[PDB]
Amino acid sequence: TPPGLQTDCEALLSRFQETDSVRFEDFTELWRNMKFGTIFCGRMRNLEKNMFTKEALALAWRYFLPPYTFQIRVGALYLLYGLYNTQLCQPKQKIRVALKDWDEVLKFQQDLVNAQHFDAAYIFRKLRLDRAFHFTAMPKLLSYRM
Amino acid sequence: CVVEENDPIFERGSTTTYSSFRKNYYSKPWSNKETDMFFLAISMVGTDFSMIGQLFPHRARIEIKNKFKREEKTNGWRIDKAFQEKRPFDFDFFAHLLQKVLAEEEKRKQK
Amino acid sequence: KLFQASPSVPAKYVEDKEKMLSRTMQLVELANETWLVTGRHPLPVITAATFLAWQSLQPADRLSCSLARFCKLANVDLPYPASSRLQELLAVLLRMAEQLAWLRVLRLDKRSVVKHIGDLLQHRQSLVRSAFRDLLLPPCMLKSPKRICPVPPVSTVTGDENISDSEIEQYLRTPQEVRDFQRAQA
Amino acid sequence: YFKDKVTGVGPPANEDTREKAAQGIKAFEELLVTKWKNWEKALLRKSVVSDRLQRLLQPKLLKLEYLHQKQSKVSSELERQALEKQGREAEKEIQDINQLPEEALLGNRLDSHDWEKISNINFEGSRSAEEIRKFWQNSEHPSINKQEWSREEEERLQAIAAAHGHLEWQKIAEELGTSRSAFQCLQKFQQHNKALKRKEWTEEEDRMLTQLVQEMRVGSHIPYRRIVYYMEGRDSMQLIYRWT
Amino acid sequence: QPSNVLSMAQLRTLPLADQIKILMKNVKVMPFANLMSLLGPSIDSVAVLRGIQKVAMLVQGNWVVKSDILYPKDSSSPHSGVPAEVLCRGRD
Amino acid sequence: VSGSGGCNFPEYELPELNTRAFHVGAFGELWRGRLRGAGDLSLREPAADSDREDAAVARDLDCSLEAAAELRAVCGLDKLKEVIPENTDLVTLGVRKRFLEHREETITIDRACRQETFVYEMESHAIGKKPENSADMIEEGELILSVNILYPVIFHKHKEHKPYQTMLVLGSQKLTQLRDSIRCVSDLQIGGEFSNTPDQAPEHISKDLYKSAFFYFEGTFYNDKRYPECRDLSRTIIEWSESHDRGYGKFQTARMEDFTFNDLCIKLGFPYLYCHQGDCEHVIVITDIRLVHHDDCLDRTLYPLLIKKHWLWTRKCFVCKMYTARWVTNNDSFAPEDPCFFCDVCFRMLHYDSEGNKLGEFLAYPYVDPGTFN
């Protein structure tokens, strides 16, 4: 796991908690202040940046666990949406979703659509339209050699 | 008929067995302050093994006997020095010292 | 069970019964001529000898093992002092390896001496003669005892009839002591 | 837990393994060659000198024991004195053998030595018999000149190689008089040789290069080692220019 | 639920490399034509050839079992007790 | 016997290390029933589009006919700022500056990824790969399984077994395809002896001489019987399992020509074993499994892809050090050590005269370098 990203995510979680509501307008206002989409271009694009954005998406979707609060869930969902939509590189790195993780998202979207939050449901609609999911049995790969 | 109470154990496959011929009686070791309190108990009561064994709940009678014999064999000078000096029989302060030794050995086991 | 290649033992540990028996007989004869059968139980010495024989039969794949591993593999209860006895025998081997020129140049140790045990058994007579010309005793007495059997002072005197009488006054119990004794175990 | 799923205390073996090991299909379990160490050199030296000393001492020790037994069995005084003189001679022989410097008792490169005894006893089965044999014959031996060249023997070396036809380098090295093994000088010979490189590129080899690229090139990195393996004559240094 | 203990029923339930091996061990002289019929038409000729080249040699057009096949390295002569190596050399 | 015990909801047996066995074939139905996932065709379009978006969203999820959500679009596409990561206080900016500084210290250029282009080109081989015909197009919901094998031992001896390759296979394919797709240098080895005649051409490699190969999936040995020359390798492994009470249950045997990857009830991340050619062993790790996507290869027959072929160091000729060796010597007369290596031009001049007569006594074997498949 990248060490600097484990601190950058906790840093952006402060501004995520700073939001007052779950309407998509707060992320549009934050984009003018906290432009997280700076390193997406950089000075070089290669396997280094590929693994960088892969670990970024992985450790960002990791914060979508059930124990996290609803506002943190909305923040993480919008962050993953923006990161995927800002992938101007050659490969299209889709976020990897586990089978166990695909159970909380159901009731999450149910609560979003029942709360009349049209933007929260349209975000997931656009994510599904872009086909930005890697359905895996486990969220990460690991071996026993170490 | 019991239900899953005992586990199978392999023991004595009927081969050539080593002749142990030894019974190592477990003896609790002696500490420094424990030796000092044993010496003061001897000086206060004498050579009455029964009384010493009664006031030593952490020890045994045979252990006290072996310790007394080893002391008489090795440090007879200290044995005579302790026997010359006398001290009246104490009961309450003796129990307080027993509790202090208990706390000390508990701290030692915690270390 | 080292003689049969049963599935419970790998094939690397299997050996011939006659060769192992001859090696163990030579080693126990070496122990007998070097004062290792007198006083101590025989079975630990026999176990140490057969362990050294099994190790010397293939030090390539058996020197890394130990006596406990060998006893666990053989399904035989190992004697407690046997290892210590083993050490003593190893020491004897060293006292032999220092006499042979190639071995004393090799500068062996307690571990690398088993591989040449056969050589030590080839000319064991001259080796033990040279070792004894430089006996075996328990390590408790081999600490250079400068005072052997100290003579006690001659104090067979008994005075005239009575040396003193205060000893009786010191040995008797006082009424307070008697009351304390009666109260302690009342 | 890496070798096999069934790697317990005693691993089993299949029947087809005999067919695999019988037809000479050794693939990877024999390519585990390692370098040497200083302690290994010292162990090999000690083992070979101990083997030679034991071979020299065993007849003398046996004769001394036989003389001891005979003088313990015989009773005549003249025979006892004769046996005592013979035993004194044998003792002096053993003494002068034990006090012999460690240069003459090393033998030669191809001297008769038991390599299996050195491998299974001294080396503890860590090195094979042939692996220590070949290492003591040419790699570790005092008769091997460890000094490097002076750029004066390669000319006569290639001259003799061209006069003989590059058939047997052993006789070439022996006639050259370098006191070194043939393989030790052949490496520097082929390192100084000019036929190893190539010349101006042709057109037909470009077809093979393009085919090998279109078949096994990966991204921006080209595996030029594969080109060296397939295309003969091209080294790894200046071949990259073929795609630079 | 002799070496020819295995019957034809137990013979057919074996790989061809062992079937031709035991056939050359029991007969020691076998033509290829009749070997095709004994092995069966379902088996290709190339496999039978590559198998018989490992356990037999060609002499005057007929296949004869190899010497080491009949006499294992650990066996000896039942008539004289000499090692099997000399027997294999004599048979060759 | 049907599928072994396992639920399609994999529970971790050890936290983040492994999972319980489960029927991987039922995933393609479970995750496709609990989630539509249809649209694996890359039919994204290069007004009417807004009308379709309204008619879809205002009927599925949205309730208002006003196009108010399009602000998101104008915040996503239009508000995107050829940029330098500076003039902002972020920790990702800090680590990017650290990487750029470490680059400017020693790293001269970007052309140093001689081992990273593998996971790039071998993945680009899976994108934009149009099928051969309409009847060969992969159907939606196809299961794809990744695997990592650990064959060789030429790498680190005093370290773990990290550096080897990774492969990827399809679920609908048969196990015979995965069997024949696994490439191993041991199949290129040649038996016999070659010192008697080095000009003798290879008549039959070990691939055709021995075709026996089986797998291990939770005590299920799948044997192959396509050719009449191969043998059943599981005939002994079962006996050694039933000769003594070792605690191993009865193992079920089956064929390979009639079993698919769907019925493989196995664990992910568990170190399984694949054995072929008598004793050639391969540690196997089933890392990930996933449904088919619109970015994967559309050719079904052409998808036993080795998504990561790890680099391997070719053994150089010990004489010239400028060519790859092909012959391994034994009992040599002039080589410094027994396992020496020689190339063609060197093996010719070593012990062969002009006419090719064998000189001296020696043994030689054809050394097939592992770089052939690498």
mmCIF file of C-alpha atoms in Angstrom, chain B:
data_model
loop_
_atom_site.group_PDB
_atom_site.id
_atom_site.type_symbol
_atom_site.label_atom_id
_atom_site.label_comp_id
_atom_site.label_asym_id
_atom_site.label_seq_id
_atom_site.Cartn_x
_atom_site.Cartn_y
_atom_site.Cartn_z
ATOM 1 C CA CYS B 1 -20.923 -44.945 28.662
ATOM 2 C CA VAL B 2 -19.192 -41.572 28.317
ATOM 3 C CA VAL B 3 -19.417 -39.441 25.173
ATOM 4 C CA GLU B 4 -16.095 -38.066 23.879
ATOM 5 C CA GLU B 5 -14.435 -37.854 27.283
ATOM 6 C CA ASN B 6 -11.040 -39.530 26.757
ATOM 7 C CA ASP B 7 -8.456 -39.215 23.982
ATOM 8 C CA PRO B 8 -6.266 -42.030 22.607
ATOM 9 C CA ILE B 9 -2.705 -42.113 23.939
ATOM 10 C CA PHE B 10 0.240 -44.225 22.768
ATOM 11 C CA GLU B 11 2.325 -45.484 25.689
ATOM 12 C CA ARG B 12 4.742 -48.370 26.281
ATOM 13 C CA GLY B 13 4.797 -50.214 22.947
ATOM 14 C CA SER B 14 6.493 -53.170 24.715
ATOM 15 C CA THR B 15 10.065 -52.440 23.612
ATOM 16 C CA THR B 16 13.280 -52.318 25.624
ATOM 17 C CA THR B 17 12.565 -49.824 28.396
ATOM 18 C CA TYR B 18 15.177 -47.619 30.023
ATOM 19 C CA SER B 19 15.742 -48.384 33.713
ATOM 20 C CA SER B 20 15.015 -45.019 35.317
ATOM 21 C CA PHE B 21 15.104 -46.127 38.982
ATOM 22 C CA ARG B 22 14.765 -42.505 40.099
ATOM 23 C CA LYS B 23 11.968 -40.529 41.771
ATOM 24 C CA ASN B 24 12.921 -36.842 41.606
ATOM 25 C CA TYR B 25 10.777 -35.436 44.405
ATOM 26 C CA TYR B 26 9.725 -31.922 43.420
ATOM 27 C CA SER B 27 11.177 -29.422 45.899
ATOM 28 C CA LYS B 28 10.255 -25.743 45.841
ATOM 29 C CA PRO B 29 13.413 -23.578 45.653
ATOM 30 C CA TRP B 30 14.616 -21.289 48.432
ATOM 31 C CA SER B 31 14.896 -17.516 48.090
ATOM 32 C CA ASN B 32 17.212 -15.138 49.931
ATOM 33 C CA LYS B 33 14.565 -13.448 52.081
ATOM 34 C CA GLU B 34 12.885 -16.848 52.412
ATOM 35 C CA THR B 35 16.131 -18.236 53.837
ATOM 36 C CA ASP B 36 16.370 -15.245 56.187
ATOM 37 C CA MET B 37 12.812 -15.715 57.458
ATOM 38 C CA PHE B 38 13.446 -19.448 57.893
ATOM 39 C CA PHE B 39 16.561 -18.632 59.933
ATOM 40 C CA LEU B 40 14.677 -16.150 62.114
ATOM 41 C CA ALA B 41 11.858 -18.670 62.624
ATOM 42 C CA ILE B 42 14.462 -21.232 63.712
ATOM 43 C CA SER B 43 16.025 -18.721 66.107
ATOM 44 C CA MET B 44 12.603 -17.833 67.533
ATOM 45 C CA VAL B 45 11.203 -21.367 67.894
ATOM 46 C CA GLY B 46 14.272 -23.634 67.989
ATOM 47 C CA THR B 47 14.585 -26.968 66.175
ATOM 48 C CA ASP B 48 10.912 -27.991 66.396
ATOM 49 C CA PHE B 49 10.245 -29.196 62.851
ATOM 50 C CA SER B 50 6.489 -29.529 63.437
ATOM 51 C CA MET B 51 6.013 -25.920 64.556
ATOM 52 C CA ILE B 52 8.164 -24.652 61.676
ATOM 53 C CA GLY B 53 6.161 -26.712 59.193
ATOM 54 C CA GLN B 54 2.909 -25.376 60.636
ATOM 55 C CA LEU B 55 3.920 -21.729 60.136
ATOM 56 C CA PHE B 56 5.248 -22.461 56.605
ATOM 57 C CA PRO B 57 2.189 -22.978 54.366
ATOM 58 C CA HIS B 58 4.332 -22.515 51.239
ATOM 59 C CA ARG B 59 6.776 -25.279 52.244
ATOM 60 C CA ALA B 60 6.760 -28.904 53.378
ATOM 61 C CA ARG B 61 8.036 -30.742 56.439
ATOM 62 C CA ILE B 62 10.543 -32.900 54.547
ATOM 63 C CA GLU B 63 11.796 -29.801 52.716
ATOM 64 C CA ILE B 64 12.330 -28.022 56.043
ATOM 65 C CA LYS B 65 14.158 -31.101 57.341
ATOM 66 C CA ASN B 66 16.459 -31.262 54.310
ATOM 67 C CA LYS B 67 17.152 -27.525 54.554
ATOM 68 C CA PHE B 68 17.958 -27.798 58.267
ATOM 69 C CA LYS B 69 20.322 -30.715 57.627
ATOM 70 C CA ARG B 70 22.045 -28.873 54.767
ATOM 71 C CA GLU B 71 22.440 -25.792 56.967
ATOM 72 C CA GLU B 72 23.863 -27.815 59.867
ATOM 73 C CA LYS B 73 26.306 -29.385 57.407
ATOM 74 C CA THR B 74 27.415 -26.204 55.601
ATOM 75 C CA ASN B 75 26.833 -23.051 57.699
ATOM 76 C CA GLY B 76 27.055 -24.400 61.238
ATOM 77 C CA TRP B 77 28.622 -21.100 62.299
ATOM 78 C CA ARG B 78 25.568 -19.117 61.182
ATOM 79 C CA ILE B 79 23.350 -21.810 62.719
ATOM 80 C CA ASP B 80 25.034 -21.371 66.106
ATOM 81 C CA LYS B 81 24.948 -17.578 65.733
ATOM 82 C CA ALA B 82 21.187 -17.704 65.144
ATOM 83 C CA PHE B 83 20.693 -20.162 68.013
ATOM 84 C CA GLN B 84 22.605 -17.962 70.481
ATOM 85 C CA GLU B 85 20.404 -14.921 69.860
ATOM 86 C CA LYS B 86 16.822 -15.175 71.107
ATOM 87 C CA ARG B 87 13.637 -13.326 70.192
ATOM 88 C CA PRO B 88 10.155 -13.576 71.745
ATOM 89 C CA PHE B 89 7.372 -15.354 69.894
ATOM 90 C CA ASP B 90 5.524 -12.960 67.575
ATOM 91 C CA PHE B 91 2.181 -13.749 65.934
ATOM 92 C CA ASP B 92 0.604 -10.604 64.460
ATOM 93 C CA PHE B 93 3.834 -9.122 63.099
ATOM 94 C CA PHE B 94 4.706 -12.627 61.892
ATOM 95 C CA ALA B 95 1.485 -12.707 59.859
ATOM 96 C CA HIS B 96 2.289 -9.223 58.548
ATOM 97 C CA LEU B 97 5.725 -10.452 57.448
ATOM 98 C CA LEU B 98 4.059 -13.467 55.814
ATOM 99 C CA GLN B 99 1.786 -11.129 53.846
ATOM 100 C CA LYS B 100 4.822 -9.036 52.893
ATOM 101 C CA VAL B 101 6.617 -12.151 51.626
ATOM 102 C CA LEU B 102 3.472 -13.076 49.684
ATOM 103 C CA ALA B 103 3.426 -9.644 48.037
ATOM 104 C CA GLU B 104 7.157 -9.878 47.290
ATOM 105 C CA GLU B 105 6.865 -13.297 45.651
ATOM 106 C CA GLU B 106 3.827 -12.097 43.688
ATOM 107 C CA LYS B 107 5.855 -9.146 42.384
ATOM 108 C CA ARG B 108 8.691 -11.552 41.557
ATOM 109 C CA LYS B 109 6.313 -13.784 39.587
ATOM 110 C CA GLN B 110 4.988 -10.702 37.775
ATOM 111 C CA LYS B 111 8.539 -9.897 36.634
#
